[PDB]
Amino acid sequence: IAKMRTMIEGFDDISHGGLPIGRSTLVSGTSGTGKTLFSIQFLYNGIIEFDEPGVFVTFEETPQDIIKNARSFGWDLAKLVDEGKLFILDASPDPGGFDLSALIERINYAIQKYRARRVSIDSVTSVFQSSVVRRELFRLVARLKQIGATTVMTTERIEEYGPIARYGVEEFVSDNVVILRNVLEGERRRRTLEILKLRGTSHMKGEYPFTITDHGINIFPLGASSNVRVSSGVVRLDEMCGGGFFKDSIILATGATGTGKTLLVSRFVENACANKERAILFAYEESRAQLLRNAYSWGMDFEEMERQNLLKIVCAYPESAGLEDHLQIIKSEINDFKPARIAIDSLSALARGVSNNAFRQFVIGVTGYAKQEEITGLFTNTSDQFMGAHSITDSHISTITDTIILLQYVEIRGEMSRAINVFKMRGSWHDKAIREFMISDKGPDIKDSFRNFERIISGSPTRI
Amino acid sequence: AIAKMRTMIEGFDDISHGGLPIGRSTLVSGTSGTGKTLFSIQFLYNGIIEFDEPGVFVTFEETPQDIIKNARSFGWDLAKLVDEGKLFILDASPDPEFDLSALIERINYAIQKYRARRVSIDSVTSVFQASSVVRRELFRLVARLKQIGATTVMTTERIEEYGPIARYGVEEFVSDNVVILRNVLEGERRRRTLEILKLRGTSHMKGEYPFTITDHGINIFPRLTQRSSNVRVSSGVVRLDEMCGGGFFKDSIILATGATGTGKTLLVSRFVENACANKERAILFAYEESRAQLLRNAYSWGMDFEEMERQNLLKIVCAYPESAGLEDHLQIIKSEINDFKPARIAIDSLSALARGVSNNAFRQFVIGVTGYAKQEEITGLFTNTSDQFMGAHSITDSHISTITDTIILLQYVEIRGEMSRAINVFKMRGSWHDKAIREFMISDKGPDIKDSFRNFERIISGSPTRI
Amino acid sequence: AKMRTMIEGFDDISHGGLPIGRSTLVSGTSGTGKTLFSIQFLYNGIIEFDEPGVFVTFEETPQDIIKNARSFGWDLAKLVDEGKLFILDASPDPDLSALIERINYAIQKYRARRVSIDSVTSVFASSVVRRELFRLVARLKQIGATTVMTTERIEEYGPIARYGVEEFVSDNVVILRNVLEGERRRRTLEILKLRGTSHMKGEYPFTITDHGINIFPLGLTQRSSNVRVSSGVVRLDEMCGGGFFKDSIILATGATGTGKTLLVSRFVENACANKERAILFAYEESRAQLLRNAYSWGMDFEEMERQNLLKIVCAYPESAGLEDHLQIIKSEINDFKPARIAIDSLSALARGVSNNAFRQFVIGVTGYAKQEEITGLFTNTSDQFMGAHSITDSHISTITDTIILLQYVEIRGEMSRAINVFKMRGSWHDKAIREFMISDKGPDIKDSFRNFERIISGSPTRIT
Ligand SMILES: Nc1ncnc2c1ncn2[C@@H]1O[C@H](COP(=O)(O)OP(=O)(O)OP(=O)(O)O)[C@@H](O)[C@H]1O
Ligand SMILES: Nc1ncnc2c1ncn2[C@@H]1O[C@H](COP(=O)(O)OP(=O)(O)OP(=O)(O)O)[C@@H](O)[C@H]1O
Ligand SMILES: Nc1ncnc2c1ncn2[C@@H]1O[C@H](COP(=O)(O)OP(=O)(O)OP(=O)(O)O)[C@@H](O)[C@H]1O
Ligand SMILES: Nc1ncnc2c1ncn2[C@@H]1O[C@H](COP(=O)(O)OP(=O)(O)OP(=O)(O)O)[C@@H](O)[C@H]1O
Ligand SMILES: Nc1ncnc2c1ncn2[C@@H]1O[C@H](COP(=O)(O)OP(=O)(O)O)[C@@H](O)[C@H]1O
Ligand SMILES: Nc1ncnc2c1ncn2[C@@H]1O[C@H](COP(=O)(O)OP(=O)(O)O)[C@@H](O)[C@H]1O
Ligand SMILES: Nc1ncnc2c1ncn2[C@@H]1O[C@H](COP(=O)(O)OP(=O)(O)O)[C@@H](O)[C@H]1O
Ligand SMILES: [Mg+2]
Ligand SMILES: [Mg+2]
Ligand SMILES: [Mg+2]
Ligand SMILES: [Mg+2]
């Protein structure tokens, strides 16, 4: 069964070629899921990408309303209509029998007049305002199939995980069914598109995070490397990794609050700017001011990094939006800036309230996108327990990370001294010595290891 | 690229990025006592009292006097607006003893008889009260109103929460924009959370945003744009300032964690006083101790709370963490800060408000309190009691240590059958701090930071060993 | 403006009472205290405000209302023949227009200001109830008479009405609930809404006693003095710097058989011997058992009981709900008017109840004690007999001003105990883990363990 490209980023991969040709697809979902956007972004692509005219049957929205709605996306549905490459067939009774019979002929007329191959009726539910519905639908879908033109059927649902329709007859009548959801994750909303089935061929089974933006529906499917050494900004740290960090690697700094992750990030961001290489600093824990000021405590003028167009500080709250939204805001700035290296301080912040699965998917997306663009990225994680921590991360996301720089507090006599350690180094040698290091106005200072101490991991070492 | 209209609702203009769609219908569904009628009333008042535009109010149940009377609670004299020819309570009430085209034709009269731009129909559910019998009628009114080019604010009712957005499960798709008012209650507390479900053609803030009804209307709660300085402020203990490398930073969040009765409430007392000694304003929010017990306890430390109370340089606001929801609590703090306008704030204790509240809802509070404290350049010291007295593995059980700049970890140390304490600056952002677990004693002159336990091992545990 | 209902608490929750000239809807399950509220609402305004009240019945006979009123010691008979109260029967002998007709008439024969209708459910129909409701409601508002309309319900957290039309049909809606917390019940009044003026939100625990509805709201505005009181143990008085505080809350925490009941009893004797009144709320031991162990400690409770100085009340932690328990506490406190109150124990009362429902009770008795210049010592038994890292499993150590720590210490194959003043709000205390032995004449607080390490773990190590 041949398929038609929708030019919707992600959807072509989720359906494996797009939607089955000369067949009607069902796109049901709650209010404000992006059903009408999925229909106005369908045809919108088949004109400015394959020059194949399109028809839009509206059952409530006026031809001017949709013309004004697509104006937010930057699309001109008025120029496409006047250019004869689009036609909005109004089905709204201007203030039950021959309605279908008539409307069907009005569609066949336009479809057979504009030489169009893609149609979309939105919404079929509103028109019916079971046996009559599921029955009078077959005729529409049948007649739609007779003119051999793929179409999109916009339907609405009350519950989010309840019925996949409204009358229970919207389904078992369509060949292909796509479901748009706006799942409420406590207080945050997460839209997920899932193809329930596609009569004929195969596709991606399950849910896939998407978002509406200036570019339209941006769906993200999950199922979609030189030995060049790079400096970290710390002389002694580059030696503990056997040269430095790999150009195409994911460094991860972990340890309790006040360990020095934010310090390592600052130097791993300034070192770039020092070598005519630009870098992005994704702040979430503190503001730009505090970064500049606290950064200024150790030198590295973060102001000159902005004037040289080599440093971009993006600060925003970890609950300001949802992972799907956050990930989009990340990749976006990366493309606009083209940074040599990025930095998320911190990951633990984005793991607050979000579900582990939704987090794991996020880290994979960010890391994956960063790894498949030759962009060296460092990620910070704060350990819940400041001492005695038996896990590097409580999110179980270490396998994704390539390097691990573990920081921890050491109780020496009656004082608190931190201890830097290269936990692992993928594709290189690393120092296996738990070295101690202080923090001064000139940044980090690595020294000797605790060779004459015991139970260093615990956080309460013992002398010999 | 869509004409937006400011609602002048504290927050609502930040959620939709401008307000509501111009010349379009907006649905505001929700249960009884959610704030549907208030919202609509505030949509008119704000609309007329600022931009100078005529509003129409289509009442169904309540009479054109009730709205005028109820609205007076927030200091809104409709009498001045009803007589000045700005507002008009178009009565559509069933007589105390399906003509949609009728009202639709009557509504156009007032709209055109005032040269409007805003309208609001209270509970269009009371007309129909057949899903198809409603959608057709609903669509007609919204469609008709659309040609008028006036922004309509609908109001529907909801039977059960976390289910249908309306009552007939059709009204949502009958309007262009759908705002859902919620009054979800966790246990025995309530929480008002407004959300924009949809907004055809434009962008908005997705998800649920906490709000509260007050005597100033609906107050919604929506950016990491604050300031920072190297200005240092005293903590009230010279020994402590030396441990912080001069004293606490002015614009920063200080968290003092430790077991029950370690000196957290002591450090607060000495912190709320150093403001009063420098002729600076300071507020104290007590959620455990009482103004009597607080003032008394503090007097055994040569601190005259009563004196500073009368010098208008100190405010003690005692209240129970289970008295109201986390949303109200936040508004109170913000209100007391906008009224007294202090340079130092003190929440005793953060652990008190975390009791019987979801960590996520509680994190939001700390972000709301801390955030509003940093942007206003107000030094905030927060107290947190650990669930474990000795052997504390994590710094906070609520996990809010990544949101604090300075941390002062107090704890007990079983030393030779005795029970001493030990103050320590765990971390200090943009400053050097003493990294030593120094022993201290309490007395009639406050704290006493002495030497460290240099000849002791496993100090953090609770039971130190001799080396 | 609102009309003071003079109901224990409700006047605070409603921030005054019921809006004057507006009908307030009161709905709940069968046995939530609807009729009572409607009755107590009228009897108050008549007996105090001197406001004629009219009661409309539909299923209950006028000879039953006055028959049930005698249960709370209310004489409706007098009020009937006196013309202060009038009961209008609208229950057909074994239509809507004639109701308000007779109602409006009966609201003028006595110049009535309060009206109570029970119920607006037995009268009924689809939207008819949503049409027949406005008729009465609008008619009552025309006569500016504060009405107490009722509603019926089958679900506690389901619909707010039996039709779901009267919900948003009124202005002020109050919801009563008889929620089943496992095997026991919990009455909770709540004000859903009130168009015009502010009010308290959320649920509020209420009880039904022989004095009507007793709702316990919220308000931390008591007093605090430096008056020192004894504890019964001389050395225990010196470890607090001159004994306990009159205006203070003391807590005795430890495993099982540390000396909590021994230290409780001694606290009740000192009050008695000082010619002061004391009450013991025993929930674990029994009268006969408490009278035995006490005699085995040198103190006699019979003597102190016969001298009307020591009241002893024992019950089961599952006998009734927290709201009921609190009532008996507040109730038995007033009548006896003690100088010292002792609860043994808060642990037994925590078991089965929820942590949130438990704290509320602890904030009730705690608050009520401190707000009555009465001293309170509360016993809490820990779940771990050795190796506890929390003072309470319910985390109520922030509510207590003084804490006593009793723990076992395995010392050379012997299981000795240890007293220690953990904290003393506004006083100096001894910061030492003093060993103590229990015997005939009560407890013997001896020396501490200066030659022992890690004593707070249960199993220390002698360091010579
Ligand atoms: N430019 C934009 N930026 C962000 N979000 C947008 C933008 N344009 C539209 N949206 C979002 O996409 C959705 C648009 O509604 P759409 O008409 O696509 O959905 P629908 O499923 O047809 O809903 P309805 O039943 O209300 O018609 C809304 O959730 C809206 O917030
Ligand atoms: N000017 C300075 N001189 C010396 N040490 C400093 C200076 N400024 C900060 N520090 C040290 O650096 C620490 C902060 O390091 P950093 O900001 O990297 O912490 P972090 O591990 O990221 O913690 P968080 O979880 O709060 O983000 C402070 O605790 C302090 O000891
Ligand atoms: N006048 C005094 N002299 C000596 N020690 C005192 C004096 N007043 C109080 N203390 C000690 O200091 C403690 C005060 O504890 P504070 O309330 O400051 O700390 P906290 O940890 O916040 O307490 P809580 O857990 O009750 O909130 C008392 O428990 C007592 O041990
Ligand atoms: N005459 C006595 N001589 C010596 N010890 C005694 C005597 N009477 C009681 N005890 C001691 O007192 C202990 C009981 O004390 P108490 O009843 O106060 O315990 P508790 O800490 O309240 O524990 P629980 O409530 O779980 O029983 C006994 O286990 C015993 O060791
Ligand atoms: N070339 C190398 N020389 C020395 N050690 C190496 C080298 N490559 C890898 N390693 C060590 O092996 C670790 C990774 O081994 P790997 O098989 O990936 O383990 P795992 O599956 O547990 O992550 C590195 O972190 C490092 O310690
Ligand atoms: N002055 C006020 N202060 C605080 N809350 C108020 C005030 N006036 C009204 N309210 C609250 O407003 C709510 C009524 O909102 P309303 O506009 O009637 O919405 P709805 O129709 O959805 O119930 C009630 O919960 C009431 O307590
Ligand atoms: N004299 C009394 N003392 C204590 N409790 C009582 C007394 N009389 C009734 N009760 C309790 O209070 C309840 C009050 O019920 P009522 O006011 O009729 O409410 P409803 O109309 O919702 O059934 C009774 O069902 C009973 O459990
Ligand atoms: Mg649509
Ligand atoms: Mg960090
Ligand atoms: Mg305190
Ligand atoms: Mg006992």
CA distance B43 to chain C (A): 17
| Ligand in nearest proximity to the CA of B444 | 3
| Ligand in nearest proximity to the CA of C293 | 4
- The residue behind tokens 């300075």 is B406
**Both B130 and B265 in a single domain?**
no
What DSSP element (H or E) covers B406? strand B406-408
- Is residue B391, in this structure, part of any structural domain at all? yes
**Both C208 and C124 in a single domain?**
yes
**B185-186 and B189-190 beta bridge pairing:** antiparallel
Ligand 5 centroid to Cα of residue A425, in Å, is 6
- Give the Cα separation of C65 and C57 in Å (integer): 9
Q: Which chains touch A (3 or more CB pairs under 8 A)?
A: B
Instruction: Report yes or no: A137 and A12 within 8 Å, Cβ to Cβ.
Output: no
Instruction: Report yes or no: C150 and C39 within 8 Å, Cβ to Cβ.
Output: no
Name the phi and psi angles at A273, rounded to 5: -55, -35
**Both A149 and A119 in a single domain?**
yes
**Both B215 and B69 in a single domain?**
yes
- Give the Cα separation of C72 and C79 in Å (integer): 15
Instruction: Report yes or no: B209 and B222 within 8 Å, Cβ to Cβ.
Output: yes
Instruction: Report yes or no: A65 and A36 within 8 Å, Cβ to Cβ.
Output: no
Residue whose C-alpha is closest to residue A342's, from A254, A264, A282: A282
Residues 6+ apart with CB under 8 A from C67: none
**Both A64 and A204 in a single domain?**
yes
- Give the Cα separation of B164 and B30 in Å (integer): 10
CA distance C317 to chain B (A): 22
Name the phi and psi angles at C259, rounded to 5: 140, 15
- Give the Cα separation of B427 and B412 in Å (integer): 19
CA angle C384, C390, C395 (to 5 degrees): 115
**Both B210 and B248 in a single domain?**
no
Of B164, B198, B358, the CB nearest to A158: B164
Which listed residue (B62, B157, B172, B288) is catalytic? B288
- Is residue B227, in this structure, part of any structural domain at all? no
Name the phi and psi angles at A191, rounded to 5: -80, 130
**Both A257 and A121 in a single domain?**
no
Q: Among A125, A415, A445, A464, which would you mutate to test the B interface (most chain B Cβ atoms within 10 Å of its Cβ)?
A: A415
Q: Which runs of consecutive H residues, i.e. helices, occur in C49-186?
A: 62-69, 76-82, 96-106, 128-142
Instruction: Report yes or no: A21 and A199 within 8 Å, Cβ to Cβ.
Output: no
Tell me the binding residues of B for ATP. 33-38, 73, 198-200, 202, 204, 214-215, 260-266, 301, 421, 427-429, 431, 433, 435
Which residue of chain B comes nearest to C1, CA vs CA? B73
- Give the Cα separation of C88 and C454 in Å (integer): 76
Active site residue A52: no
- Which residues form the pocket of ligand 5, taking CB atoms under 6 Å from any ligand atom? A 424-430
Choose the residue to mutate in C36, C187, C214 for probing ligand 7, maximizing ligand atoms within 8 Å of C-beta.
C36
What the block records as the tokens of B424 is 């320590």
Residues of C with Cβ-Cβ distance to B290 under 8 angstroms: 220-222, 224, 370
Residue whose C-alpha is closest to residue B28's, from B47, B10, B7, B46: B7
**Both B267 and B184 in a single domain?**
no
- Is residue A224, in this structure, part of any structural domain at all? no
**Both A237 and A213 in a single domain?**
no
- Give the Cα separation of B246 and B235 in Å (integer): 10
Contact A321 B207 (CB under 8 A): yes
Rg (CA), chain A: 28
CA angle B7, B13, B16 (to 5 degrees): 115
The terminus-to-terminus CA distance of chain C in angstroms comes to 77
CA distance B52 to chain A (A): 27
- Which residues form the pocket of ligand 4, taking CB atoms under 6 Å from any ligand atom? C 254, 256-262, 284, 296, 381, 438-440
Task: Verify whether ligand 7 is closer than 6 Å to residue C122 (CB atom).
Answer: no
Instruction: Report yes or no: A118 and A5 within 8 Å, Cβ to Cβ.
Output: no
What the block records as the tokens of C273 is 């011997």
| Ligand in nearest proximity to the CA of A214 | 1
Choose the residue to mutate in B264, B287, B413 for probing ligand 3, maximizing ligand atoms within 8 Å of C-beta.
B264
Q: Which chains touch B (3 or more CB pairs under 8 A)?
A: A, C
| DSSP conformation letters of C318-364 | TTS-HHHHHHHHHHHHHHH--SEEEEE-HHHHHSSS-HHHHHHHHHH
Neighbours of B298 (CB within 10 A): 26
Please tell me what DSSP assigns to residue B264. Answer: H
- Is residue C244, in this structure, part of any structural domain at all? yes
Resolution in A: 3.0
- Give the Cα separation of C266 and C247 in Å (integer): 19
Of B31, B261, B320, the CB nearest to C220: B320
Which residue of chain B comes nearest to C402, CA vs CA? B261
- Give the Cα separation of B238 and B249 in Å (integer): 14
**Both C355 and C248 in a single domain?**
yes
| DSSP conformation letters of A296-354 | HTT---TTHHHHTT-EEEEE--TTSS-HHHHHHHHHHHHHHH--SEEEEE-HHHHTSSS
- Give the Cα separation of C368 and C219 in Å (integer): 10
Which residues fall inside 5 Å of ion ligand 9, going by CB? A 261-262, 346, 380
**Both B337 and B404 in a single domain?**
yes
- Give the Cα separation of C91 and C369 in Å (integer): 48
Residue whose C-alpha is closest to residue B246's, from A297, C124, A438: A297
Q: So which residues of C are the catalytic ones? A: 59, 284
Provide the experimental method for this PDB entry.
X-ray
- Give the Cα separation of A330 and A282 in Å (integer): 8
Could you give the C-alpha distances from A330 to A271, B403, C201, in angstroms and in order? Answer: 21, 22, 41
Instruction: Report yes or no: A76 and A50 within 8 Å, Cβ to Cβ.
Output: no
Single residue among B220, B250, B272 that ends a domain in this structure: B220
- The residue behind tokens 């199922």 is A223
Residues of C with Cβ-Cβ distance to B163 under 8 angstroms: none
- Is residue A116, in this structure, part of any structural domain at all? yes
Choose the residue to mutate in C256, C261, C263 for probing ligand 4, maximizing ligand atoms within 8 Å of C-beta.
C261
Closest ligand 7 atom to Cα of C118: 21
CA angle C6, B323, C342 (to 5 degrees): 85
Residue whose C-alpha is closest to residue A155's, from A126, A116, A132, A176: A126
Instruction: Report yes or no: A128 and B132 within 8 Å, Cβ to Cβ.
Output: yes
Whichever domain contains A19, its CATH number is 3.40.50.300
Smallest CA separation from ligand 2 atom 14, residue: A258
What the block records as the tokens of C131 is 């049409």
- Give the Cα separation of C168 and B29 in Å (integer): 12
Instruction: Report yes or no: A157 and A165 within 8 Å, Cβ to Cβ.
Output: yes
Sign of the torsion formed by the C-alpha atoms of A153, A159, A161 and A163: negative
Residue whose C-alpha is closest to residue A57's, from A96, A95, A100: A100
| Chain breaks after residues in chain B, where C lies over 2.5 Å from next N | 97, 129, 222
Contact C453 B261 (CB under 8 A): no
Sign of the torsion formed by the C-alpha atoms of C190, C192, C196 and C200: positive
Rg (CA), chain C: 28
- Is residue C183, in this structure, part of any structural domain at all? yes
Closest ligand 4 atom to Cα of C379: 22
For B74-106, give one letter per residue: b (16+ CB within 10 A) or e. bebebeebbeeebbbbbebeeeeeeebeebbee
Residues of A with Cβ-Cβ distance to B365 under 8 angstroms: none
Q: How many domains does chain A have?
A: 2
- Give the Cα separation of A213 and B202 in Å (integer): 9
Which listed residue (B61, B105, B208, B457) is catalytic? B61
Of B169, B200, B435, the CB nearest to A69: B200
Residue whose C-alpha is closest to residue B385's, from B274, B282, B258, B228: B258
Residues 6+ apart with CB under 8 A from B202: A72, B2, B4, B16, B17, B18, B21
- Give the Cα separation of A319 and A188 in Å (integer): 8
- Give the Cα separation of B318 and B135 in Å (integer): 52
Single residue among B220, B248, B266 that ends a domain in this structure: B220
Residues of A with Cβ-Cβ distance to B193 under 8 angstroms: 187
Hey, which residues does B452 pair with through a beta bridge? B438
Closest ligand 3 atom to Cα of C401: 26
Q: Between C128-142 and C96-106, two packed helices, what is the crossing angle to 10 degrees?
A: 20
Single residue among B168, B185, B220 that ends a domain in this structure: B220
Contact A414 B2 (CB under 8 A): no
- Give the Cα separation of B207 and B197 in Å (integer): 8
**Both C32 and C102 in a single domain?**
yes
Neighbours of B2 (CB within 10 A): 17
- Is residue C220, in this structure, part of any structural domain at all? no
- Give the Cα separation of B132 and B137 in Å (integer): 9
Dmax over Cα atoms in chain A, in whole Å?
Answer: 95
Which residues fall inside 5 Å of ion ligand 8, going by CB? A 35-36
Of A128, A187, A257, the CB nearest to B402: A257
Smallest CA separation from ligand 6 atom 9, residue: C196
E-only strand ranges, A101-226: 118-122, 150-156, 176-185, 188-198, 208-213, 216-219
Residue range(s) defining the domain that contains residue C104: 2-215
- Is residue C156, in this structure, part of any structural domain at all? yes
Neighbours of B377 (CB within 10 A): 14
Active site residue A207: no
Smallest CA separation from ligand 5 atom 20, residue: A399
Ligand 9 centroid to Cα of residue B267, in Å, is 26
- Give the Cα separation of A16 and A2 in Å (integer): 10
What the block records as the tokens of A322 is 């949802």
Residues of A with Cβ-Cβ distance to B230 under 8 angstroms: 293
Please tell me what DSSP assigns to residue A13. Answer: H
